[PDB]
Amino acid sequence: SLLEFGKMILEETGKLAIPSYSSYGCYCGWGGKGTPKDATDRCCFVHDCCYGNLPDCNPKSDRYKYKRVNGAIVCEKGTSCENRICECDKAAAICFRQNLNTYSKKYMLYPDFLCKGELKC
């Protein structure tokens, strides 16, 4: 679920999901069009694609379970949707951590009109 993803992000990065990742660049928090602004934004682009791979799942509300094995995120077995949703979120949280070094506050609340063109998943 969005709230779970949010807590996973905070655990991973030390940044609050809202507002650090809820309106960042072209794809974080609301994505759809444009060339991603940086690596962090590409994390969201890929996460959007990941959810897009699951048309008949509901990642905003469906809750999954996971555990930490010495830092590592391990998705635990639920329904197929939950498993796949968890793997998407896990990847994004890792991606955000891997790109904290280039995160830029200038891309927070990035305006929609600077995000143009469709980029295929």
């Binding site: 807590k7 655990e11 555990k67 930490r68 010495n70």
Partner: peptide
């Protein structure tokens, strides 16, 4: 909140 050690 999601502790296990440290």
């Amino acid at each position: 909140y999601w502790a296990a050690a440290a």
